[PDB]
Structure formats: C-alpha cells, structure tokens
C-alpha cells in the first residue's frame, strides 16, 4: 500500500488527472478520489487541499493565503479542532445508532469517548514554555562569577568564531519575538501560563543565561543596536504588564439570589476596573460571560408555593437581564 | 431550520434521482450525492445524514443482515471498529501535524491512543444479558420450587391473558436475537461462551422453567417448540462455545527454539475437528502475517551473517509450516 501511495503522490505531482468541467468543488474532490481510483487502476492515508494541495512545508503559506480531502474509509475537511469535533460527531452518531441495536463495556466506551472530547477541549488551551541554555562555556561562566563581572578568562573573548555567538543570539531573539507574537477559564489559565513563561522570560532576561554576556558582546561590535532585542525586552515588560492586566478576574462561582446579586455587583466592579488594552476580545469575553451567567440562571433553576418561587426567580431573571443591559451600556 | 433543510434534502433524495448515471463507481455515486447536496443548497437558497436516506440531530437491519454519513459545513465520512480506526488514523494525522510546532499536547495525543484502545475494546466486547418476570414470578420462585409443588402462586389463572402472552413473547424475542448474534476474537468467543452460560442459567428452574410449565399447564402456544428446538439450539451453542472455546496456545515475543515450539503449537492447532469455515482461514492468514512480524521483532559481521543464515533456516521452517497449512487447508 505504501508503494502505491508513493506512486499516487508521484502521479499527483507529475500528472494531475485532467479535470472534467463539473464545477462542484465537492464534485472536484470526488473527482480527486476518482483520480486516486485511477491511480489504483494504474497500480493494479493521503491528503490534499484546495490551486490545490497533495500530501500524506508551504502549508503555513497556504494557511496564510478551503477544503481538505483525507482518505483511507474517507474524510472531508470543509487543524485538530475540526478533527476532534468530527470525531465527537461520529461518536454522537454511533451513540444515537446504539439505541438500536447493541454492553456495559460499550457504555464504558461511550463514557471514554466523552472523556476524549473533554481531553480534546483541554488541548485547545495551549502553553509551551522555553528555557534557553545557549553554550557550554556560558554554563562554565554561570558556574563561575556573573557575566556583569569579568568572565575571568585572562582573555574573555575568542575572535575566531563569535559567529556562534551571533547565531545563538539571533535565534534567541527570533524565538523571543515568536513567543511575544504568540502571547475561557481555560483562557485565563493560559494567560497565567503566559505570565509564568514571561517570568521564565524574565529569568531569561537575567545574566546567568549570559544575556549580560550578550549585552557585553553587543558592547562587542556585531549587532550592537540590539534595539529589537532591547525593544523586545520593553515589549516583554509590556506583556508582563498585560498579564498583570489579564491576571485580574472577577470570580464566576459555582452554586442564593442575594449571592447572585453580589456576583453581579462584582461583575459590575469588573466592568468598572481600570482600562487595559481591549480588542473586540474584551467584548467577546463579555458576551461569553453573559452566556455563562445565563448558565448560572440555569444552574439556579436546576405546588403553588413552588410556582410563586418560580415567579420570584423570573423577576430575578428580569433583573439579571436588566444587569446584562447594564453590561451593554458599559460596553458602549 | 437546519433540521428542516436536512429533512427537505432527505425528501428530495427519497424522491430525487441522481439524475445522470455515467461512469458509476462508489466514489462517483458519492460525488453525485455531493451534487444532490448541491441541489439541497439550491433548494434552501450539529446534524448527521446517512445516505438510502436517514438523519440524526428496518432497512438498516436488513442491510446489517445481508454507506456514508455527511455531518453538518460538512464532514462527509464513508461499523464501530471502522469508525474508531478512522478516528485513530485522524489522531495520528493530527499528531503528525505536530512536527509543525507541549507535554500536555503529548498527554492529549496519548489520550487519543487511549481512546482508540478503548474503542477497540468496545468493538470486541458487546454482550447482552437477561430478562425477568419478577413482580409475581420471582416471589413464587422464592416461595416454591420450579415444580407445581405447593404451587405457591395464584391458583386462579386469568389466562395471563396478556401477562402470560407477554411473558412468552418476551422469552421468544430474546431467544431469536441472542442466538443469532484475533485475541479480540478469542475474547469475543469467550464472551459468547459466557452468554451461552447466561442462556443455560436462563434454561434453569431459577429461570421460568416453571413459567413455561404453567404456559404448558394451560394452553401454552406462544413459545413454539422452537422453544424446545431452541433448547436444542442452545445445546448446539454450548457445543459451539466448546468449539468456540479453542486454545491456540501461541504467544508473541532461545528465540529460534521458541519459534520452533510455536510452529509445533501451530501444527497442534492445525489438528482440528471444528473451526470457523472461512473465519478460521482468515485467522490463519492474520496469524501468518503476525508470525512474520514476530520474526521482525526478533530481527527488526561474520556472526551477524551466521545469525542471518540461522534466520534463513528459520524462514525455511516457516515456509514448511506454511506448506503444512496448505495440507490442512486441502
């Protein structure tokens, strides 16, 4: 099968099937599958994109500049999240199918699929933190006195190959820039992780890394301005300040109508809180919060006296809707 | 709305032709289905729609006895094991995407493989157990033996009427479906054996042998002799479990001697009076590939050349074992 797939990939690169004018880009996809069937005839899991991609490099460029066709017993994307959701949909369909005809192990498997969905949801929150350890001589220097302090080699620099110094410096600068660029409750946790990474970033800022060594080299002729690294430090300070800004959160609380009112007052205080740069993102968060609060109304919702209590709950819900109106007024 | 559109699409498909029939292959028919979707889109101008047409937001049973579902922005898939395998392949592709560029993400990838594993167990282990007339019968079973005896159950017979009828009907329905229903295969056969033992428990005085006797006691014809024939069939099923119970006694991994022992065990398995008529052959084929894999696991300089020669002698022995397979196949 591997060899056939390779032959098919070769044919796709060399000889894309000449295409009947069917419009119907889904139709074109199926046509692609037909071309693959032709590849099978010629021989007698691989993937594509939409003027089109063939695959089992430039993918980022393609994302920068749409329907993906995965086979093998088929697929159609129309990027994990989609895959996870599709898997979940398939599982849901299987669960619906079970009603007729199927045991406790199968229920265990169904529970496991929901667990997998839950795990996939956690995955959407994404943090990686990078600890930068450049050089063996740098490590020896770290074991020795601080680089602000003389290195205490009687000659502290070797002229022949700083090229490595530059290479280690440029890469670090690039990685830090990318980290800077990259920078719900999950979102807050992720922002916290970002803060911790910045703190790692602040540890990176420090000398032992021999960022001071780098500064001393910057005293050294090559790439001295180092403004983009230095401007990058300023930007990292700004990011830490934003994490300080992101870090503040009014509590949203698991389950008291008075308590709900207190929560609303706290939310109003949060709406009041000092400005930090909000893109629509703050509005989207505001919207998600309102939806969650309705969810809280649902949690609260979760006999004539009972009917009266329900009516009282409805009056509260009206007040909550009014408070949401407050949210809209603040949003203005 | 979306559901209404899906329903309309299904209605048109039920009365909508795939208009032109040229160069018909399954993928082509799926293309035509995509075109039909085009028609649905034109007509409109998460859900799932199997296609036949049905939705989710007897024909299938006939199909199970004797093709594609397009989710809803479509995820057009084309069978729990198959689904799980597809999911596993998707998970592997997602992990493969990773090279793009943490430990949490690896945890998530491990979790997907765990899900594939769980899904495989789900494919392996479906099994369905028991029925109980308990409100009046269970108390009677507690009070008196499965014999008329004291007969410590209401002397009046209402002829069930419906109760007896329902009891018999439920017993008949249960009988019909359960009976009809690699290592995984062995585990499944074991589950089948246990289900047959459940059937034997169903057979007993603890079971409504007494209910059956009562049905007999009055005009009893809701459980046919098929019921008695069903007991014969259950004996046959126990015999099959005896058959389905079968020990390969063959193990994946001195090594050469172990392989010789495995070949001897395979020869012992080849000794056979019962086996799946084509399933045993498929298992034989799967085993031969797994044995090559085991050879790879064993495997995957003059001493090295000697080891290669020893491997070649083994390969000859494996070819001989394959020849022995052919004789048994005759």
Region for A227 from its dihedrals, namely left if φ exceeds 0, alpha if ψ lies in -120 to 50, beta otherwise: alpha
CA dist B7 and B46 (Å) reads 14
Q: Which residue from A296, A232, A310, A238 is spatially nearest to A267, judged by alpha carbons?
A: A296
A chain contacts of residue B94, beta-carbon cutoff 8 Å: 80, 83
Q: Token pair for residue B292?
A: 């090559």
Q: How many CB atoms within 10 Å of residue B165? A: 13
- Neighbouring residues of A294: CB distance < 8 A, sequence distance ≥ 6: A320
Q: Which pair of structure tokens corresponds to residue B171?
A: 């017993």
Which two three-digit tokens encode residue B174? 């249960």
Separation of alpha carbons A300 and A257, rounded Å: 9
Look at residues A264, A266, A255, A257 and name the one whose alpha carbon lies nearest to residue A315. A257
Distance from CA of B315 to the nearest CA of A (A): 24
Instruction: Determine whether the interchain pair B75/A77 forms a contact, defined as Cβ–Cβ distance below 8 Å.
Output: yes
* B248, B269 contact by CB (below 8 A): yes
Cβ-based neighbour number of residue B55 at 10 Å? 17
| DSSP code string of B15-79 | H-------S--HHHHHHHHHHHHHHHHHHH---EEE-----B--HHHHHHH---EEE----EE--
Instruction: Confirm if A72 and B86 have CB atoms less than 8 A apart.
Output: no
DSSP letter (8 states) at residue B299: H
CA B26, CA B221: separation in Å to the nearest integer?
48
**Between chains, do A112 and B118 touch, taking CB under 8 Å as contact?**
yes
Given A59, A72, A105, which is nearest B125 (Cβ)?
A105
- In DSSP notation, B268-289 reads HHHS-S---TTHHHHHHHHHHH
Fill in the DSSP letter of residue B223.
S
- For residue A53, the cross-strand partners are A49
Q: Does A103 lie at the interface with B, CB-CB under 8 angstroms? A: yes
CA B216, B218, B220 angle in degrees (round to 5)?
Answer: 50
What is the DSSP secondary structure assignment for residue A17, as one 8-state letter? Answer: P
How many CB atoms are located within 10 Å of the residue B284 CB?
A: 18
Question: Considering CB atoms only, which of B83, B94, B126 is closest to A106?
Answer: B126
* Beta carbons of A102 and B71 less than 8 Å apart: no
From CA B318, how far away is CA B136, in angstroms rounded? 63
Residues of B (43-62) whose Cβ lies below 8 Å from A: 46, 48, 56, 61
The full length of chain B comes to 330
What proportions of chain B, in percent to the nearest 5, are helix, strand and coil? 65, 5, 30
Could you tell me if A79 lies within 8 Å of chain B, comparing CB atoms? yes
The reply to whether residue B30 touches residue A33, judged by beta carbons under 8 angstroms, is: yes
User: How far apart are alpha carbons A184 and A239 in whole angstroms?
Assistant: 19
Exposure letters B22-47 (e unless 16+ CB within 10 A, then b): eeeeebbbbbbbbbbbbebeeeeeeb
How far, rounded to the nearest angstrom, does the alpha carbon of residue A223 sit from its chain's CA centroid? 33
Q: How was this structure determined?
A: X-ray
Locate A200 and state its tokens. Answer: 């790692």
Q: How far apart are the first and last CA of chain A?
A: 61
- In b/e form, how buried is each residue of A78-88, taking b as 16+ CB within 10 angstroms? bebeebbebbb
Residues in chain A: 332
Tokens in use for A17? 């099937």
Q: Which of B74, B97, B61 is nearest to A74 (CA)?
A: B74
CB contact under 8 A, A116 and B121: no
Name the resolution in angstroms.
5.0
Other residues' Cβ atoms within 10 Å of the Cβ of residue A44: 6
**Interchain pair B46, A102: CB under 8 A:** no
Nearest to B269 by CA among B286, B285, B250, B255: B250
Q: CB of A139 within 8 A of CB of A210?
A: no
Determine the Cα–Cα distance for residues B91 and A31; give it in Å rounded to an integer.
26
Q: Which of A328, A192, A316, A322 is nearest to A271 (CA)?
A: A328
| Cα atoms in the Cβ-side hemisphere of radius 13 Å centred on A98 | 20
Chain A contact set for B91 (CB, 8 A):
83, 87
Strands B48-50 and A53-55: unpaired
* Whether B163 contacts B215, CB under 8 Å: no
- Check CB contact of A196 with chain B, cutoff 8 Å: no
Number of Cβ atoms within 10 Å of the Cβ of B199: 22
- Compute the nearest-CA separation of B169 from chain A (Å): 19
Burial bucket for residue A132 (CB in 10 Å: 0-12, 13-18, 19+): middle
Q: Check B126 against A116: CB less than 8 A apart.
A: no
What is the distance, to the nearest Å, from the Cα of residue A2 to the centroid of all Cα atoms in its chain?
Answer: 33
Element (H, E) at B212: helix B209-217
∠ at Cα A243 (A238, A248), nearest 5°? 135
Residue written as token pair 């085009």: B38
What is the 8-class DSSP label of residue B233? H
Alpha-carbon A144 to chain mean position:
40
Q: What is the nearest CA distance from B201 to chain A, expressed in angstroms?
A: 19
Pull the structure tokens for residue B251. Answer: 């193990």
Q: Is A18 exposed, middle or buried (0-12, 13-18, 19+ CB in 10 A)?
A: exposed
Rg over CA atoms, chain A: 29
Q: Does A41 touch chain B (CB under 8 A)?
A: no
Tell me if B108 and A119 make a contact (CB, 8 A cut-off).
Answer: yes
Pairwise CA distance, residues A7 & B161, whole Å: 71
**How far is it, in rounded angstroms, from Cα A296 to Cα A277?**
28
Check if the beta carbon of residue B110 is closer than 8 Å to that of residue A120: no
Query: Would you call B186 an interface residue with chain A, using a CB distance cutoff of 8 Å?
Result: no
DSSP letters along B66-115, please? ---EEE----EE--HHHHHHHHHHHHHHHHHHHTT--HHHHHHHHHHHHH
Contact B131, B170 (CB under 8 A): yes
Cβ atoms of A83 and B93 closer than 8 Å = yes
Which H or E run includes A332? none
Sort out which chain A residues have CB atoms less than 8 A from B31's CB and list them.
24, 26-27, 29-31, 33-34
Nearest to B34 among A24, A37, A59 (CB): A24
d(CA A266, CA A248): 12
In the numeric block, the tokens 């069978």 are attached to B79
Q: Which of B81, B104, B174 to mutate to test the interface with A (most CBs of A within 10 A)?
A: B104
Q: How far is A120 from chain B (nearest CA, A)?
A: 7
- Residue A66 at interface with chain B, using a CB cutoff of 8 Å: no
Helix H, strand E, coil C: the string for A120-167 is HHHHHCCCCCCCCCCCHHHHHHHHCCCCCCCCCCCCCCCCCCCHHHHH
A78 inside 8 A of chain B by CB: yes
Dihedral sign, CA of B62, B66, B68, B71?
positive
For residue A101, whether the previous peptide bond is cis, meaning omega lies within 30 degrees of 0, is yes
Reduce the DSSP state of residue B141 to 3 states and report it: helix
Asked if residue B149 lies in contact with residue A129, where contact means CB atoms within 8 angstroms, the answer is no
Convert B134-161 to b/e letters by CB count within 10 Å (16 or more is b): eeebeebbeeeebeeeeeebeeeeeeee
Could you give the CA distance from residue A31 to residue A25 in angstroms, rounded to a whole number? 9
Point out the residue among B61, B73, B78 whose CB comes nearest to the CB of A78.
B73
Chain-centre distance of CA A160, in angstroms? 42
Are A8 and A36 a contacting pair, CB within 8 Å? Answer: yes
Q: Does A112 touch chain B (CB under 8 A)?
A: yes
CB distance A83–B105 less than 8 Å?
no
- Is the separation of the CB atoms in A102 and A140 below 8 Å? no
Among A104, A186, A79, A118, residue whose Cα is nearest residue B111: A118
Structure tokens at B314: 């083994």
Query: d(Cα B6, Cα A104) in Å, to the nearest integer?
Result: 33
Q: Do A29 and B27 touch (CB under 8 A)?
A: no
Other Cβ atoms within 10 Å of B19 Cβ, number: 9
Name, in order, each residue with C-beta under 8 angstroms of B290's C-beta and a sequence gap of 6 or more: B182, B252
Full DSSP string of B166-189? HHHHHHHHHHHHHHH--HHHHHHH
* Nearby residues of A223 by Cβ (< 8 Å), 6 or more positions away: A166, A169, A170
B82 CB within 8 Å of a chain A CB: yes
The DSSP secondary structure of A41-85, one letter per residue, reads HHH---EEE---EEE---HHHHHH---B--B--B--B--HHHHHH
- Residue from A225, A239, A176 nearest A205 by CA: A176
DSSP string, A287-302: HHHHHHHHHHHHHHH-
Radius of gyration of chain B, Cα coordinates, nearest whole angstrom? 28
Extract the tokens encoding A302.
Answer: 């979760």
User: B10, B49 in Cβ contact below 8 A?
Assistant: yes
- CA pair distance B78, A197, nearest whole angstrom: 44
What is the C-alpha to C-alpha distance for residues B312 and B295, in angstroms, rounded to an integer? Answer: 11
> Nearest residue on chain B to A122, judged by CA atoms?
B108
Between chain A and chain B, the number of residue pairs with CB atoms below 8 A apart is: 157
Alpha carbons B215 and B208: distance in angstroms, whole number? 10
Q: Are B93 and A26 within 8 A, CB to CB?
A: no
A54 beta partners: A48
Establish if B71 touches chain A: CB-CB under 8 angstroms.
Answer: yes
Indicate yes or no: CB of B75 within 8 angstroms of CB of A76: yes
Helices and strands in chain A, H and E counts: 13, 2
Residue B203 CA to residue B197 CA, distance in Å, equals: 9
After which residue numbers is chain A interrupted with C–N beyond 2.5 angstroms? 44, 50, 56, 65, 72, 78, 102, 183, 255, 302
Chain A residue numbers with beta carbons less than 8 Å from the beta carbon of B22 are: none
Distance CA A56, CA A47 (A): 5
């Amino acid at each position: 099968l591997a060899n056939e797939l390779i032959e098919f990939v070769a044919a796709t690169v060399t000889g894309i099937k000449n295409s009947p004018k069917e419009n119907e880009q889904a139709f074109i996809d199926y046509l692609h599958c037909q071309y693959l069937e032709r590849f099978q005839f010629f021989l007698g899991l691989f993937v594509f994109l939409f003027i089109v991609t063939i695959d089992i490099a430039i993918y980022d460029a393609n994302l920068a500049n749409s329907t993906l066709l995965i086979i093998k017993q088929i697929s159609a994307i129309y990027n994990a999240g989609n895959l996870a959701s599709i898997i979940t949909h398939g599982v849901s369909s299987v669960f619906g199918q079970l009603i007729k005809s199927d045991i406790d192990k199968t229920r265990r498997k169904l529970d496991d699929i929901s667990k997998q969905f839950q795990q996939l949801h956690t995955s959407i929150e994404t943090p990686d933190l990078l600890a930068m350890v450049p050089s063996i001589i740098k490590l020896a220097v770290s074991k020795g006195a601080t680089s602000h302090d003389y290195a205490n080699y009687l000659p502290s620099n070797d002229l022949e190959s700083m090229r490595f110094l530059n290479i280690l410096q440029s890469i670090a600068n690039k990685w830090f820039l990318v980290l800077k660029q990259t920078l719900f409750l999950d979102e807050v946790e992720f922002w916290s992780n970002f803060y911790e990474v910045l703190k790692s970033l602040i540890e990176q800022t420090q000398s032992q890394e021999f960022q001071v060594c780098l500064s001393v080299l910057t005293n050294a002729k090559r790439f001295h301005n180092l403004t983009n690294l230095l401007n990058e430090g300023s930007l990292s300070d700004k990011f830490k300040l934003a994490d300080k800004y992101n870090q503040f959160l009014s509590s949203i609380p698991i389950d008291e109508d008075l308590q709900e009112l207190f929560p609303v007052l706290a939310s109003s205080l949060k709406k009041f809180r000092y400005s930090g740069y909000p893109v629509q993102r703050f509005v989207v968060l505001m919207d998600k919060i309102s939806q969650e609060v309705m969810d809280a109304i649902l949690s609260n919702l979760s006999y004539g006296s009972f009917l009266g209590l329900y009516e009282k709950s409805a009056g509260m819900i009206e007040e909550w809707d009014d408070i949401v109106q407050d949210v809209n007024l603040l949003i203005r």
